[PDB]
Design a protein around this ligand. Structure first.
Ligand SMILES: COC(=O)[C@H]1CC[C@@H]2C=C[C@H]3CCN(C(=O)[C@@H]4CC[C@H]5C=C[C@]6(CCCN6C(=O)[C@H](Cc6ccccc6Cl)NC(C)=O)C(=O)N54)[C@@H]3C(=O)N12
Length: 109
């Protein structure tokens, strides 16, 4: 497992029932979010840990063909079959770092 980026973001998941974003893992705050490349089998995952307490708040596969939506310069989103994820980045630089790496993984897959 090699990290290909680190970016600061508040990791959100969408509550489909109540139609609002909610903090991933339960508590609002910023995480260090990586994309990890499993060099062995050429897979990628998003893993993020809260800065305060190290809680893993996201651990999710990036499948080939994923549609990554850059809604604003600091809020990006994507889906899986269960959840919609949103990253509210700490700065535009962090958003550019993470989107660059995500776009790279999706070209590589
Ligand atoms: C308290 O108020 C807040 O929540 C504030 C502060 C935090 C955050 C920051 C910023 C803006 C940016 C706008 N935005 C939203 O949520 C927007 C507005 C419209 C609303 C409608 C649907 C949403 C939610 C569920 C997924 N989806 C979609 O659009 C998805 C997007 C998508 C498109 C293609 C591939 C994958 C995906 Cl995933 N479409 C599809 C077909 O799946 C969505 O995100 N929405 C954020 C926002 O308001 N807020």
């Amino acid at each position: 497992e090699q990290s290909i980026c680190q970016a600061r973001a508040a990791v959100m998941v969408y509550d489909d029932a109540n139609k609002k974003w909610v903090p991933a893992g339960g508590s609002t705050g910023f995480s260090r979010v990586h994309i990890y490349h499993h060099t062995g089998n050429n897979t990628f995952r998003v893993v993020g840990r809260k800065i305060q307490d190290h809680q893993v708040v996201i651990n999710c596969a990036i499948p080939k063909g994923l549609k990554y939506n850059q809604a604003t310069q600091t809020f990006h989103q994507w889906r899986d079959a269960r959840q919609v994820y949103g990253l509210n980045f700490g700065s535009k630089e962090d958003a550019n770092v993470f989107a660059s790496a995500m776009m790279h993984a999706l070209e590589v897959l």
